[PDB]
Design a protein around this ligand. Structure first.
Ligand SMILES: [Ca+2]
Length: 563
């Protein structure tokens, strides 16, 4: 009669990808005269993304539109049915390998053993890396917390020193906001009723220039200066992205600072001084400091825009050379500029205390070293928001990372994520939570996933129930959609790159030498996955022959590796 197939895709609703997938279901009805209908489902609507394989195998779903290498843990061949690092890197090469060099039937025999019919690949895009750490060379990957899709992709970055996690794309945004895993620099804000203010305790990790890390434990309390009513918040956190730079025309010891601050951590829809921040507000900071008796003064000026959460400031040490590293002063040197979403406005203590302002006190303990004690008044002086600070430091090793100036000029939480290409990652908001894009050099712009293929895979019993004329038409339909989908994604990507620059994202290009370093790690990983079983061996053997044929692999660089 009429055949109806439920098919869930890896694409989340509200991506370019899902819109294209939805149009595919209409094309299939057209091409089959209404006889085959595909009911489309966005990611998660029927089962979790990574649960699609078992759902289709058992028939809960009739089919799926996944990224094929998601099955790498249970079907090694699938790590070879989508690009892997520094291998074949053009869409046309993967088309050739699939449709004339044996790939399609290699995939179909492997999936038939699982009760699945692999229809064909779906072309898509390269992938980008979105990072909160400025990763400018190979060695900067060490200690990064990186989301990736498992398999060989994760193994390559793990071998370069990264910690890897596996998450679906629709969960990447909140993960990047919280450090991806293990630790972050988020400040949980808690009401302090007895001081009619707030308190917070958090831990900053300062990178040591030669490796590894210097911990700075922060204790914080805030109390209003005046007696007007303030807002006492429910639990929530502030997440800050900070960029530190230098002014090339400034000769005093200084720090140029750019920050983006968002309040979060309250779920939407659960059962006066704010007006002063509706536009751009000038800022002045003054700090008078004394660390082990080394005296100094810092002045800063700039502005903040709480509607955006953006701060722009320049700081100068006016007494000469700063005796401590500038990154150790970032937390001391105006949380009233945080961007609070509409549904969280009632939790903004910092703006509620203005204009008379608030006192901010901290103790900051550097592990195995001295401590800072800081006290600050933050308030309006006229129309300028001012932060005046006294800082006193004691018990520091002149030997140490602080007085020895051994800390990297940086301030970030080490989180980064690959997912897909720039347009869909923009659909998911990555530009808001990561201000760097890490790409390869112009010779090798995509190091880990240059050809990130989807597919259609159908429950094998459902497939065999379909009359053969509709089978062939569905195969044709998928092959046509592979390139319609590709073309749609590529068009959106053209629109997305300018939007990244407007959001303040910087594109960082690694070097050819960085690529060579990845390549010496990638080739052994190819052979290890290839040897897992007979399907992965067959697919890599034919890909390796092809790569040798077009000059992508030399025999010398294998250094003895063979199947
Ligand atoms: Ca990816």
């Amino acid at each position: 009669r009429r055949y109806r197939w439920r098919i869930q895709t890896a694409w989340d609703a509200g991506t370019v990808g899902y819109s294209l997938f939805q149009k595919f279901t209409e094309r299939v009805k057209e091409l089959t005269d209404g006889q085959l209908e595909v009911q489309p489902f966005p990611a998660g609507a029927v089962v979790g993304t990574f649960d699609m394989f078992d759902a289709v195998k058992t028939g809960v779903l009739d089919g799926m539109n996944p990224f094929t290498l998601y099955w790498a843990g249970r079907m090694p061949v699938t790590a070879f049915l989508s690009s892997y690092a520094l291998g074949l890197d053009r869409p046309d090469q993967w088309e050739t390998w699939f449709y004339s060099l044996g790939g399609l039937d290699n995939a179909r025999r492997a999936f038939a053993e699982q009760g699945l019919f692999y229809v064909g690949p779906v072309q898509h895009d390269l992938n980008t890396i979105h990072s909160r750490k400025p990763i400018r060379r190979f060695e900067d990957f060490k200690g990064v917390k990186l989301r990736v899709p498992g398999g060989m992709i994760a193994e390559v970055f793990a071998a370069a020193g990264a910690s890897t996690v596996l998450l679906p794309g629709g969960e990447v945004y909140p993960a990047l906001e919280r450090g991806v895993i293990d630790w972050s620099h988020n400040v949980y804000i808690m009401a302090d009723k007895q001081r009619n203010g707030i308190k917070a305790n958090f831990e900053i990790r300062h990178n040591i220039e030669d490796g590894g890390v210097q911990l700075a434990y922060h204790y914080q309390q805030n109390t209003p200066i005046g007696d007007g009513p303030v807002l006492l918040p429910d639990n929530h956190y502030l997440s800050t992205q900070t960029k530190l730079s230098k002014d090339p025309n400034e000769k005093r010891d200084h720090m140029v600072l750019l920050e983006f601050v968002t309040a979060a951590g309250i779920t939407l829809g659960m059962d006066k001084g704010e007006e002063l921040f509706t536009g751009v507000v000038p800022i002045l900071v003054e700090l008078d400091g004394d660390v082990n008796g080394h005296k100094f003064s810092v002045s800063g000026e700039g502005e903040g825009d709480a509607t955006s959460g953006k701060l722009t400031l320049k700081f100068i040490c006016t007494t000469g050379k700063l005796p401590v590293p500038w990154p150790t002063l970032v937390t001391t040197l105006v949380q009233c500029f945080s961007r609070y979403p509409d549904h969280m406005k009632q939790h903004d203590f910092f703006k509620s205390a203005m204009p008379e302002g608030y006192i901010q006190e901290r103790t900051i303990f550097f592990k195995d070293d001295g401590n800072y004690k800081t006290r600050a008044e933050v308030k309006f002086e006229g129309d300028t928001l001012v932060n005046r600070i006294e800082l006193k430091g004691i018990d520091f090793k002149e030997d140490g990372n602080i007085l020895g100036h051994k800390l990297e000029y940086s301030f970030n939480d080490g989180g980064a994520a690959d997912f897909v290409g720039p347009a869909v990652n923009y659909n998911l908001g990555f530009h808001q939570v990561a201000k760097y894009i890490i790409m390869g050099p112009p010779e090798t712009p995509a190091i880990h996933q240059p050809v990130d293929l989807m597919d259609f895979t159908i429950n094998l019993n459902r497939w065999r129930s379909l009359p053969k004329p509709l089978q062939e038409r569905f195969i044709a339909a998928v092959h046509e959609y592979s390139w319609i989908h590709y073309a749609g994604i590529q068009k959106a990507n053209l629109e997305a790159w300018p939007k990244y620059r407007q959001a303040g994202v910087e594109v960082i290009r690694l070097s050819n030498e960085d690529v060579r370093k990845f390549r010496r790690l990638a080739i052994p990983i190819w052979f290890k996955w290839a040897k897992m079983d007979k399907y992965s061996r067959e697919a890599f053997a034919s890909q390796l022959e092809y790569m040798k044929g077009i000059g992508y692999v030399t025999d010398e660089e294998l250094k003895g590796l063979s199947l």
